[PDB]
Ligand binder design. Structure first.
Ligand SMILES: O=C(NO)c1coc(-c2ccc(Br)cc2)n1
Ligand SMILES: [K+]
Ligand SMILES: [K+]
Ligand SMILES: [Zn+2]
Length: 354
C-alpha cells in the first residue's frame, strides 16, 4: 500500500513580525520535513502536490465575513496587521498568512482526494498555520481556517454528503472550532483528547468538558476526553484509546479518518506540559489504521518543540508506511476519573462501551 506525503515550503512565509521567536515558527514544518528525509521516510512516500484552497471551499465551513477579513490582510500595512491580529485571541498575521492558510487547507484537500480516489492508502500532511481552533466566523489560537473541518466537508463534497468521517484530535488543546462546526452533525464524529484543568487551560472554555456530547441529531457524535491534574503520557493515552476512542470509532465505522495531529502533548513541549513519547504516537497511529480500511490522513496542528514534533510525526509516518510498532504502568487516579466520566456520558449513545 502507498503512503502519501504533502509538504510545501511556501507555508513557511506566515510569520510573526513582532516576535520572531513566537512558538508557532515557520521552522516547525521544515524541521519535520528534514527529519523525514534523514530517516528515509520521505523517499518511501508518494509525493502529493500542495494547492491553494478556493474561497468556495472555505465556504464549506466559514462565513463570508470571516473569509473576507482574513483575505483582506494580504494587502495590509504592518500597523493594520498588528491591529487586526490583536482583535482575535492569540493570533498574529503577516501579508502571507492568508495564502499559507489556503495552502494548508488545499494540501489536505489534495491528500484526502488521493486517499478517497485510491491513489494512496493513507497520508501525512506537514502543514501550517494550524486549524482546529478556528471557528466558522473567527480566527483563534494561531489558526485562521479549520483545515481538518474543511477537509471533512471537502471529502464529503467529492464523495457523498453522508460519508462518515472520524476526526481524532490528539493535539493537547481542545479543537473548539471542530467541535462547534460539527456539533449538530451526525456524519462527522469528533473525538478530542485535551488538557482541561477544569476549564482553565487554553482555549479556556467549558465547551471542552466531557459532558458536551453534541446537540440535536449530533448528540453522541462529539466525544471530549478532558485531562485534569496530571502530566499525562503514553499510559493515559493508550487507556483512553482502549476504553473510548477505538470502541466508539468501531461502532461509528468511519469511511475516512482525519487526525488533527498536534504534537504539543509530546514530552519536551512547554505549551502542553505532557509526556507522550514518539513511540506513543506510533501506537495511536497504528490503532487508527485499523479503521476505515486504513484511510487515515494525519494533519499537523500544534506542537512546538522542534525536535519532539519532528521525531513524533516521523514515527506516525513510519506506522502509516507499515513499519512494526515500536516497543512501549497503571494510570493516575485522575486519568481514571476522566475516562470514567466520558464513559458515563457516552454510554447512552455507544452500546459497545463497557
Ligand atoms: O497549540 C495550540 N493549539 O493547539 C495553541 C494555540 O494557542 C495556544 C496558546 C496561546 C497563548 C498561550 Br499564553 C498559550 C497557548 N496554544
Ligand atoms: K485535542
Ligand atoms: K459531531
Ligand atoms: Zn495545541
Amino acid at each position: 500500500p502507498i503512503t502519501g506525503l504533502v509538504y510545501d515550503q511556501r507555508m513557511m512565509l506566515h510569520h510573526n513580525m513582532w516576535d520572531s521567536h513566537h512558538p508557532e515558527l515557520p521552522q516547525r514544518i521544515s524541521r519535520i520535513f528534514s527529519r523525514h528525509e534523514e530517516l528515509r521516510l520521505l523517499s518511501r512516500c508518494h509525493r502529493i502536490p500542495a494547492r491553494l484552497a478556493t474561497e468556495e471551499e472555505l465556504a464549506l465551513c466559514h462565513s463570508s465575513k470571516h473569509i473576507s477579513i482574513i483575505k483582506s490582510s494580504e494587502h495590509m500595512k504592518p500597523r493594520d496587521l498588528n491591529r487586526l491580529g490583536d482583535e482575535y485571541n492569540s493570533i498574529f498575521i503577516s501579508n502571507e498568512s492568508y495564502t499559507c492558510a489556503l495552502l494548508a487547507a488545499g494540501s489536505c484537500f489534495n491528500s484526502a482526494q488521493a486517499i478517497l480516489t485510491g491513489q494512496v492508502r493513507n497520508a501525512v500532511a506537514i502543514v501550517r498555520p494550524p486549524g482546529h481552533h478556528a471557528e466558522k466566523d473567527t480566527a483563534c489560537g494561531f489558526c485562521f481556517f479549520n483545515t481538518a473541518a474543511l477537509t471533512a466537508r471537502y471529502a464529503q463534497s467529492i464523495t457523498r454528503e453522508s460519508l462518515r468521517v472520524l476526526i481524532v484530535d490528539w493535539d493537547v488543546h481542545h479543537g473548539n472550532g471542530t467541535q462547534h462546526i460539527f456539533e449538530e452533525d451526525d456524519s462527522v464524529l469528533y473525538i478530542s483528547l485535551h488538557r482541561y484543568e477544569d476549564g482553565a487551560f487554553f482555549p479556556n472554555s467549558e465547551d471542552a468538558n466531557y459532558d458536551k456530547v453534541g446537540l440535536g441529531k449530533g448528540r453522541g457524535y462529539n466525544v471530549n476526553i478532558p485531562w485534569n491534574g496530571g502530566k499525562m503520557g503514553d499510559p493515559e493515552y493508550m487507556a483512553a484509546f482502549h476504553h473510548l476512542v477505538m470502541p466508539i470509532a468501531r461502532e461509528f465505522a468511519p469511511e475516512l479518518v482525519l487526525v488533527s495531529a498536534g504534537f504539543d502533548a509530546a514530552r519536551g513541549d512547554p505549551l502542553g506540559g505532557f509526556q507522550v513519547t514518539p513511540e506513543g504516537y506510533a501506537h495511536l497511529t497504528h490503532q487508527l489504521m485499523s479503521l476505515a480500511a486504513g484511510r487515515v490522513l494525519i494533519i499537523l496542528e500544534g506542537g512546538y518543540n522542534l525536535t519532539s514534533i519532528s521525531e513524533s510525526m516521523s514515527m506516525c509516518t513510519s506506522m502509516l508506511l507499515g513499519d512494526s510498532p515500536p516497543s512501549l504502568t497503571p494510570l493516575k487516579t485522575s486519568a481514571t476519573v476522566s475516562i470514567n466520566n466520558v464513559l458515563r456520558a457516552h454510554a447512552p449513545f455507544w452500546s459497545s462501551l463497557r
